[PDB]
Amino acid sequence: MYSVKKSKSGYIFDKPRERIAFMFLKDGTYFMYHDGRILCYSLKPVDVSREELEEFERTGEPPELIKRVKAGKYPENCVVKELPPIDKGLAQLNPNRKCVIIFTGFQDTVIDYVECNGETLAVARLIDEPGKVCRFAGKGNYKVAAVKLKRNEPCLTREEFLKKVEECR
């Protein structure tokens, strides 16, 4: 089942490794969709009515646009990107996956994260350049890993991060 977050700004339908977000901006409704492998979104508005979003929240069935996106039929001017694999360092822990994009000011970034002993272990990678990585272990939100990645701030080395994962297990 989707957990649904709703505001005058829009809708967010989340599952551990999936997000469908809708944003209401000046010129209409914008969407972003991602699962474990695919990230799809448009910088132009899409034909998604608020009635469809209400229906999604109340019944669980996605708008027709989302069904086509899930099936591989993508509308015009829709960015389509294949995601890197779930971070090997966190893979055994069954991590959550989320993507952050231009809508919140980021280059397309995928974050694999777990909450372990009240700390966050997150690995953020640039989707276009998967070598660019920030490994984060701390008390903040998983998004922090993306933020540091965006700001060129230093992050944990592979060794340090795997140490943290081990300590957590």
UniProtKB/TrEMBL annotation:
Disulfide bonds join C40-C78, C116-C168, C134-C155. This is Uncharacterized protein. It comes from Thermococcus kodakarensis (strain ATCC BAA-918 / JCM 12380 / KOD1) (Pyrococcus kodakaraensis (strain KOD1)).
